[PDB]
Symmetry: D2
Subunit: 263 residues, 4 copies
């Protein structure tokens, strides 16, 4: 199936590793030029080198903190300078949380609000004008199954991912007039490096069977009884930003191996 | 994007016309063998001829009423004897309703229950064993935006589409162990022959501006301010049934141009 | 808080025991006249005697099967004959299921469709005209948390309760015209006789710790870690049908001790 | 129906006018002592006197901005000094928004985050320990129908109300162990002073029929074709915080006259 995105310019936040890098590789495979954004310069360089080598597309690296307005401004200026504008934006930079409401400091709430919600707000303000001028575009917000089905250990993440899912919907209705299609994807358990790190930490004192820990997580939460690979998730992002998904507007698509317990 | 559908056997109910026919074309383009199912065989012949001649695929026609156990039984036996079993099943046969609860006959409720729900129940019972023996497969239920956001004029359709959406989710958890992935797609406004007929009928005594009537429907319901084509919807069915959507289990995916008013 | 229902006529289906009887007690305590409906004649008569003597209200028994058109007809005519019409209707008659989709007979699907959905359809057609003529009323559908969050062992019940929840919503928008307010309540774990019977059956060969079995069900499903009493659930039904809940229209109210895992 | 809240201490944020004032009057009618909280001292002083005079309960005035940590701390300290602790908390202080995403300033996003979300976080942190020590309690978050069904003109309000609805759910699971029951209410169109002010502003140049403007808003959005009164809505708050609603945990209850378009 032709995706029709060859030569389009795709900005992916948090794309030096995990889901965001698999998304970038997915778009590059379809011939899209890539703007990679993350904090660490080294991983960003490898990601870009590998994408250009494997796929022969143009890749721009932007090494900034998208949780800050300065960082978002830098992404916008870099896109402008190298490409003029973006055709596709994926908001993916983020991380899990771990607290109780009774104990967490206000600054932690603020941190996740800036990272998960305000990055998406600021990136839309900053890149929508360019997208409009190019004749339209696609914007995806990678929220989480937790945006509707909260995990007990991470209330701050649950609340801010819920906010992001609503933001996606409100943005979709605002910019569809510009031929810009905005949607949300809500992943379930996706095997990424922090899950492995966590699995090791949590099994340090009971035998170190970190793969067993992960399997028990999957057994508890997902009828499919396994984690997804980032590549398998990335396919959905590529499809949703393609010329084949032109009636998808303001929707939330769960990719979760059965983990969502309700309709 | 490679779909990995070539040589797979896809059974599409209600595929002589409209959305089901567009789905069959979408699968044929990707090299799938097609089982077309509908009541009126003239349209089945025409559809099957076109698919064979345009796409070079094998097409089996089954002219039966899927709202009956006997019709379903014939579909199952036609598939087993011609192909061994199915890889893909798309439950699509259906039609809208038009009544009030206060006036509708019990028999009309029964008709939609048989057509929209029992067809899917009976096809799963009949086809899942063959699918299991083949190593897995994909089942999609084409319900509707009305399965969650009911349209005032068709309460029976709303209730039975809602039931179909829940059926999809229950079947998903029962059969995922067999590597059979079940999902639901809920379309919004899709321009099919019956919409054009209704438009012409509702405007016959006021100017015959049927295109104007359809535009007013789109303006009322969809932020994108147009109907989708069957072809644009069909892309989503092909993708969900492909090797690229292997983590989608028990999900409901709206394809509705913004029509869904909630998260 | 004054409920304003003294002297109102409340029809409760399935009210010779369990939740339905508790709802009838709740209404009787607020001075409503009661129409009790169930199949077993003596059980129903004794439930009626107890209400009448404990609460001093009028109680009318209709001993019929509400899954049949003839049973519903009898209810409507008994209400018309004794009271003129109803002010309140609670659709409650029902029972759980237990099957797989692969094994269940078509006849079992039909039974639950008639009992859970058509009973509500037929009672609305039969009773709404009298309620209209009385100046308005309240209709509640007792569905289940399973109408949105399906339990693995009972797919038929999940599908038909989902259908009922949608019916509630469609009826709500049809009759609000007439000052009839329709809503749905979705209960979680409610300790009724069949739960106790099941706990005793499933523990007969491992120590008979039936209370232990029920506690394990509560621990698995509900954050509150207990079942509700029917009486505690009944309060919500009485409130929703009162003069105090006059803006509740087309809503679904979960009363579930935290069991719903999503927003 | 006895609510069983006589002598309980209820803290209602934003309770000098509109919905919050109506909720305070509803709890006072049931014998509850009241903590009234709002910014404008004169209105608050007046409302407190009136309540004390009319219902003969204790009324504590705390004139602070609950969007600030200092304001929340002053509520917590005043409650501690006068009453020891709270039995009931209603998070109600808030206001609508009006902007586009493309035009709104970062500071406006922050303002609503602090007002609608952080107020509830901070008040929960501050009051839950006193509630736990008193043996349990009830907390309600007054979010909005917009938390799930966004209104086009107020994206910031929609996003922050959605965040609040998720916060309510996450808090509910964290504190049910303390016998503290947390729920969300999502009102539809409630006739409050700002609706009247808006209706006048918007009809200033087209005839001044502000009541007609409000009727058109209700006709557009609500099947019941009217606004609710704040007193109508307040009944639901009082009921949910009563001894009759003891199995309501982590639920969201819409009170919206049919405005929600989906299940
Ligand atoms: N993994 C999972 O199970 C699921 C993940 N998600 C969502 O997927 C998204 C990505 O997660 P995942 O791939 O697991 O995470 P990883 O930690 O593997 O990757 C996160 C990426 O984001 C970057 N990043 C983090 N913070 C910032 C920042 N402030 N500014 C710029 N870049 C940043 C990281 O690079 P660097 O540190 O150099 O900045 C890295 O490239 C997140 O939004 C997460 O919520 C949703 C559901 C499930
Ligand atoms: N069009 C739209 O805007 C939307 C449609 N849908 C759903 O899409 C599905 C397809 O509808 P659409 O393409 O619009 O309609 P069409 O009328 O164009 O296609 C319906 C197909 O179903 C077949 N069919 C109907 N009843 C039976 C039956 N008892 N047994 C076997 N085949 C049957 C019809 O052929 P025959 O009559 O010869 O049997 C025809 O092939 C339906 O389920 C509909 O509810 C959902 C949302 C929106
Ligand atoms: N208990 C629970 O945990 C939950 C229950 N529910 C729902 O609550 C409702 C009541 O259930 P519950 O109280 O537990 O069940 P019970 O079996 O304890 O009570 C059912 C009542 O309905 C009557 N009844 C059953 N079938 C019919 C029929 N065909 N016609 C007329 N009356 C009938 C029964 O009497 P008779 O047999 O004599 O006809 C009895 O009076 C059901 O709809 C159930 O699905 C929802 C969520 C949870
Ligand atoms: N009216 C409606 O149709 C709907 C309203 N709601 C929600 O209901 C809640 C009440 O709104 P409503 O009654 O309409 O509005 P009003 O403006 O009439 O009342 C708001 C109350 O909150 C107070 N308040 C506002 N900001 C603060 C603050 N920062 N700190 C302390 N008190 C504050 C106000 O007093 P002061 O200005 O002096 O501080 C006032 O007493 C809001 O959360 C709103 O979003 C939800 C759905 C619909
Ligand atoms: O979104 C999820 C799980 O789906 C969260 O648990 C994590 O924060 C995720 O980012 C993996 O670390
Ligand atoms: O859009 C979706 C995904 O299907 C949502 O509707 C979810 O089902 C949930 O947030 C509410 O139904
Ligand atoms: O699902 C829809 C449109 O959203 C139904 O109302 C129609 O009946 C459709 O099946 C074709 O008319
Ligand atoms: O029907 C009954 C009675 O056993 C319930 O237990 C259902 O399984 C379900 O509604 C529980 O919420
Ligand atoms: O919640 C609503 C209406 O449903 C918002 O439009 C406003 O903020 C309201 O609170 C003020 O009029
Ligand atoms: O997962 C099994 C399978 O047959 O399901 C249907 C897919 O089209 C096909 O690619 C896949 O191999
Ligand atoms: O005693 C219960 C009852 O149903 O018994 C039968 C009587 O006819 C009726 O009046 C009465 O309420
Ligand atoms: O709204 C009509 C009515 O009969 O509905 C049922 C309520 O119990 C009653 O108080 C009310 O007046
Ligand atoms: O529980 C969240 C919610 O919005 O889910 C959908 C239901 O309509 C409603 O009852 C419920 O409040």
């Amino acid at each position: 199936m032709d995706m029709g995105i060859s030569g389009k310019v795709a900005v992916i936040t948090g794309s030096s590793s995990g889901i965001g890098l698999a998304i970038a590789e997915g778009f590059a495979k379809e011939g899209a030029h890539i703007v990679l954004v993350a904090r660490q310069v080294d991983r960003l360089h490898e990601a870009a080198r590998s994408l250009k080598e494997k796929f022969g597309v143009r890749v721009l690296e932007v090494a900034v903190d998208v949780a800050t307005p300065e960082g978002v401004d830098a992404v916008v200026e870099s896109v402008r300078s190298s490409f003029g504008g973006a055709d596709i934006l994926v908001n993916n930079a983020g991380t899990g949380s771990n607290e109780t409401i009774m104990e967490a400091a206000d600054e932690k709430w603020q941190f996740y609000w800036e990272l998960l919600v305000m990055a998406a707000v600021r990136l839309a303000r900053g890149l929508v004008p360019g997208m409009r001028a190019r004749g339209g575009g696609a914007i995806i917000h990678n929220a989480s199954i937790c945006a509707v089905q909260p995990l007990w250990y991470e209330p701050i993440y649950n609340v801010t991912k819920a906010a992001l899912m609503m933001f996606s919907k409100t943005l979709a209705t605002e910019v569809i007039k510009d031929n810009i299609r905005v949607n949300c994807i809500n992943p379930g358990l996706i095997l990424t490096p922090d899950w492995i790190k966590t699995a090791k930490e949590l099994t340090k004192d009971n035998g170190g069977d970190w793969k067993g820990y992960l399997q028990s997580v999957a057994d508890e939460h997902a009828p499919i009884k396994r984690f997804a690979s980032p590549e398998e998730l990335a396919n959905f992002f590529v499809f949703l930003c393609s010329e084949r998904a032109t009636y998808s507007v303001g929707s939330a698509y769960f990719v979760d191996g059965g983990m969502l317990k309700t309709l």
